[PDB]
């Protein structure tokens, strides 16, 4: 399916003239373009195609000082990364890339970009692990919906028109720390090309992820200090609202054992949707739950 050394020495993006990284080389390509990799060639020159700019690593460092970057243009998930490089971190150090060829969603489903397309990126983090993580997904969210200026959903998801604009996927590292050992990893559609889907570059065409990237993180970071103090405190609750694209909606909740509907009342101290369903205020943690509008 994959040449990963090709790719790899195409990930440049720069026109080669080619040289040999194999054994069917119309192959590999045509394999890569069935993957979806966009590939161009003017005679004898090839050249992968990034869906925007390459991002500029040194910048990225600079323009995110003390925090360390680890920047990839081909990666298998900047979340791996994170989890195998856990020991020479430091609380906020990051993990960037252009394309993942095993980007991760929840419960083994997948995340899908094309080449420089997106801003993906995951980051260490550590709680006290006397404190609990109820709400982190909130915070996030809101988090870039505040940078972007868009809305959230329940529990953690990107919304622009109602449409999905990208991903939160919160993962727990097994490491020995006295500490609780996140890994976060965000995925925000800037120019793509299932259901619909959203993209940066229908608001702010002229957006540019080399510095949307270091103000969804210098923002992030901020709203996380902010929950190690405060957690799901009213004043959360009240900007939760206000980017909240579901609040006091006729709302139906997905849950294992079937669908309950009724009026959307914000969210508890622990992130819990709250809903009013009949007569009663009826509460659901976030896991697998899913959200729809009546
Ligand atoms: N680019 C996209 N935009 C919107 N929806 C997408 C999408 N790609 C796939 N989907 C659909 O979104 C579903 C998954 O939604 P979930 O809530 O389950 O899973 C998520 O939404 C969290 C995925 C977060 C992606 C970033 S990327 C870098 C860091 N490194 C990783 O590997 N992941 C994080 C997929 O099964 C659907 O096909």
Redesign the pocket.
């Given at each position: 399916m994959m040449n990963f050394t090709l790719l790899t020495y195409l990930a440049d993006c720069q026109p080669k003239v080619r040289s040999e990284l194999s054994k069917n080389l119309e192959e590999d390509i045509q394999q890569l373009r069935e993957i979806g990799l966009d590939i161009l060639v003017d005679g004898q020159d090839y050249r992968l195609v990034p869906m925007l700019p390459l991002l500029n690593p040194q910048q990225i460092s600079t323009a995110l000082f003390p925090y360390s970057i680890h920047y990839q243009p081909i990666i298998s998930?900047?979340?791996e990364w994170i989890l195998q490089n856990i020991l020479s971190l430091k609380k906020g150090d990051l993990c960037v890339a252009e394309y993942?060829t095993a980007?991760?969603?929840?419960?083994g489903?997948?995340?899908?970009?094309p080449f420089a397309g997106?801003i993906?990126?995951?980051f260490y983090w550590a709680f006290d692990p006397k404190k609990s993580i109820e709400g982190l997904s909130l915070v996030i969210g809101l988090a870039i919906a505040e940078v972007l200026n868009v809305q959230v959903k329940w529990p953690?998801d990107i919304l622009f028109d109602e449409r999905?604009l990208?991903?939160?996927?919160v993962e727990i590292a097994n490491h020995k720390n006295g500490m609780l050992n996140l890994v976060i990893?965000?995925?925000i559609?800037v120019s793509?090309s299932?259901?619909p889907?959203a993209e940066v570059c229908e608001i702010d065409p002229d957006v540019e992820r080399q510095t949307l990237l270091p103000k969804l993180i210098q923002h992030l970071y901020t709203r996380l200090n902010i929950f190690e103090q405060n957690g799901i405190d009213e004043e959360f609750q009240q900007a939760w609202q206000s980017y909240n694209a579901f609040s006091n909606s006729e709302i139906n909740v997905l849950t294992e054992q079937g669908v309950i509907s009724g009026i959307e009342q914000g969210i508890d101290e622990r992130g819990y949707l709250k809903v009013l369903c009949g007569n009663k205020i009826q509460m659901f943690n976030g896991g697998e739950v899913s959200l729809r509008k009546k």
């Open positions: 998930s900047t979340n993942q980007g991760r969603g929840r419960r489903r997948q995340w899908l970009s997106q993906m990126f995951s953690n999905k990208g991903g939160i996927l990893g965000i995925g559609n793509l299932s259901q889907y």
